Design a protein around this ligand. Sequence first.
Ligand SMILES: *[C@@H]1O[C@H](CO)[C@@H](O[C@@H]2O[C@H](CO)[C@@H](O)[C@H](O)[C@H]2NC(C)=O)[C@H](O)[C@H]1NC(C)=O
Lengths: 47, 49
Amino acid sequence: GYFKIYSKHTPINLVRDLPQGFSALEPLVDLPIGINITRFQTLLALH
Amino acid sequence: YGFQPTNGVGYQPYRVVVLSFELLHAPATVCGPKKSTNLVKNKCVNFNF
Ligand SMILES: *[C@@H]1O[C@H](CO)[C@@H](O[C@@H]2O[C@H](CO)[C@@H](O)[C@H](O)[C@H]2NC(C)=O)[C@H](O)[C@H]1NC(C)=O
């Protein structure tokens, strides 16, 4: 029931256009919503 | 309601608030503030951090 989000923003410019390397992630937000969700989408902006 | 200035006790309107507490139905979110105390240094003292 706890919904926890981990984030990492700073990139590593080891190579071009492929995510080589690795780095740890630290939690930001924890929400005791308690209800499962099976499907999700994403919001974008067009022109 | 029929009320008058100083009409008695049973006719004077009273503010009434009912509080219902929900427990064990979800993760606990509302709590009471527990009293803390000062710390000590270089003494054999049990702790409850
Ligand atoms: C998450 O999944 C669980 C089971 O997979 C669902 O649990 C049921 O929830 C209903 C609520 O209407 C209860 O009446 C059932 O008794 C529950 N069954 C079990 C086996 O737990 C739940 O609905 C799903 N969604 C949530 C929690 O948001």
